[PDB]
Enzyme design. Sequence first.
Site: not given
Length: 129
Positions: A35, A46, A48, A50, A52, A59
């Site tokens: 990650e 992301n 969308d 959002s 992380d 998220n």
Amino acid sequence: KVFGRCELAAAMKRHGLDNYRGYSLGNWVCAAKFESNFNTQATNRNTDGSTDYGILQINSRWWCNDGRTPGSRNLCNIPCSALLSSDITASVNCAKKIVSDGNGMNAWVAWRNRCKGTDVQAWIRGCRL
Ligand SMILES: [Cl-]
Ligand SMILES: [Cl-]
Ligand SMILES: [Cl-]
Ligand SMILES: [Cl-]
Ligand SMILES: [Cl-]
Ligand SMILES: [Cl-]
Ligand SMILES: [Cl-]
Ligand code: NA
């Protein structure tokens, strides 16, 4: 902060991730490696809109507030910035909520695709834990 492998294993064990919801410590270290490469300051935007955050790339759609993810929730009741701290407490507390959500560690696409079914104990081999 960029953790050492065994340094992170130790921090995660002290904060009670070892065998949390039945996932051995190597699963959590493997997830953090793919990650964030063990970097608490890792961020990823992301499609969308959002984002992380942190060592386990948590998220903003569900788990933290960043003020820029329309319609989102803040189920860990934290600013997303808390997930970038050198102190992994906020990240571990929030991960415990996520892994309890019903899909276990499959919530982490990188765990499913790179850690699940592998020799995850390799990730803690050598470590004084
Ligand atoms: Cl490594
Ligand atoms: Cl393990
Ligand atoms: Cl928001
Ligand atoms: Cl909320
Ligand atoms: Cl906030
Ligand atoms: Cl820590
Ligand atoms: Cl499970
Ligand atoms: Na949010």
